[PDB]
Symmetry: C3
Subunit: 252 residues, 3 copies
């Protein structure tokens, strides 16, 4: 020895760089919403950002198919799951002529956050299909006069499960069923995710204001629907090195 | 007496809390755009936020049906109201083969703002179908070189009508016809609405910068189209406790 | 002489006002993305703003037709260019049953920025069809762990061509082919464009924070598709006084 210590060190320096770079304010943080349907389809929305990642999905995007991801025949609605159906979700007995639950009404979601993130600061907000603020403990959806838009329960960090990649925690995942218990049966969502900062300077304001504001919407949002989770994982999540928890509880 | 003063006080404390909570920076402010069509349909877009509410609608969303709200048959365009029609709106005599005015070209809008709002600061901006800045006094739509994006007339507060809920003013509404007089015949819109602050600390910046920026897009936008105003009011506005001025000038 | 010096001066004052107004923080800055298709179609997206203009397009909007601009028959997808096709773009050999290259997959884009702009500060970011960060020098699309979201090469100013209107430079244009050389063959994009400031006060923060943040999304985005560049120029760009470089290298 040591014949190849230089090659070894270079590989180590490469591994260190790539792993620690996640801490840079100029690396990416990822937020993925994965919607699950009773036919096995998963619909994926993936947002990226540097300092802040914020977004929402209304019922038009929570359902499948939709204008973003039509079905194989190019349809953005299914018979009996169109406007009349949506009206029956907005208001109890306010519908006409539709399936009671849509094949395209998701039954659960996985919310995955990855990167060097201020985990404690993550907000995930649930609303009813009409935009009413939904709260836990079965009080129903709140009106606009009574609705607290920033509730204690939006802070989901403690319920998120750590997802590891090699020896580091790469992200966290929250799995929830849409059953009117821990989330609405027909929810819409908003979320905010924030960069973990390694110093005290506020990079969302001051000399950083211009780029902070621009960064909110200057990264494309990826979306598609996959026939099943198996295909989604091999063709999207794995190659992007995005951690994901599968239907069996395993990190993949 | 007084046998039930405690129950009375508790109800009073409940009523006070819910009514005054609108003043909290963490309550919701609502902006609703209601588009009216000559077949009686109303198309609703409802934005919510805490400190700032901002948004826009281009012609693709000003018209009905569209990708957000297809018609009962799942169509996002009507024959003779498709691309050729849109081209004829963008530029005078720039179309081919389309209805002169679309059944799905709205004839009026109600712009409703509700919550504890800095009313004086509200902006509503009108643009032509091509994105040209539209100004009052019939000068036409302005080019990009001449277009003032923040005009005196964007400040619509004085033209808005107060809408009361019980003994308090809950919101304000502005009704306008799309007739090239007080608004374009084929408009597109942008708006900004701002929280009324009860103190001097700037919650859009400084220590509040990160959440201020995130809040711009972290609440889902509700949208649907209803067969008529009557149905919209009973199934959406009333239950959400959103004030709304009906076709007869009444607050409902 | 001079019989009409007053009329002359007034016209000169008018010309000076309109030309210099571009420098006002309350004038408009324009960003236009023009996508080019092998059937001659051009698809236009035009954003406006005062201090900052930021945005993105994912594959659903990079392609033609789409939910924003259906084809003449109202279709938002073409056979063999639907979900299966998109899957084959997201991941090599991850598709089934689709055209190898879509008629609706653009082959090039012109990115045009106009107004009083901090030219040096412009960012244009390229990503693959899966949202992977794309870098020059053929290293492929980067994973999320390794992806630098703000790279040196995002600063495209030096590659942009100046476009003049009369005696002033009105904007700059960047033309690029989607050929895996200087941009991805199947790209998605994000961009940030910033106001040139004539003073040192930061109008993206401080006392300007509230309007700065609101301005990010309070101007409608114009979009349409035109049968060819000739028609687009005469019916949209020319009347808006938006500079544009045609297929022959001429400013029009």
């Amino acid at each position: 020895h040591g014949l190849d210590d230089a090659q070894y060190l270079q590989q180590k320096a490469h591994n260190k760089r790539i792993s620690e770079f996640r801490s840079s304010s100029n690396s990416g943080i990822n937020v993925t919403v994965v919607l699950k349907y009773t036919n096995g389809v998963v619909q994926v929305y993936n947002w990226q950002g540097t300092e802040v990642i914020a977004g929402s999905l209304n019922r038009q995007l929570m359902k499948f198919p939709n204008y973003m991801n039509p079905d194989k025949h190019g349809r953005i609605e299914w018979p009996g799951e169109g406007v009349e159906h949506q009206h029956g979700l907005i208001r109890s007995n306010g519908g006409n002529g539709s399936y009671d639950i849509g094949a395209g009404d998701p039954y659960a979601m996985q919310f995955i956050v990855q990167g060097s993130v201020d985990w404690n600061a993550t907000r995930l907000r649930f609303f009813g299909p009409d935009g009413s603020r939904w709260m836990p403990d079965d009080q129903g959806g709140a009106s606009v006069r009574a609705g607290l838009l920033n509730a204690a329960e939006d802070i989901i960090n403690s319920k998120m499960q750590p997802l590891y990649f090699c020896d580091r925690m790469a992200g966290k995942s929250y799995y929830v069923r849409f059953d009117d218990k821990y989330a609405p049966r027909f929810p819409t969502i908003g979320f905010e995710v924030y960069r973990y900062r390694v110093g005290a300077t506020n990079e969302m304001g001051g000399e950083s204001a211009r780029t902070a504001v621009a960064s909110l919407i200057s990264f494309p949002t990826f979306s598609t629907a996959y026939v099943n989770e198996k295909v989604a994982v091999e063709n999207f999540f794995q190659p992007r090195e995005l951690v994901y928890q599968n239907s069996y509880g395993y990190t993949v």
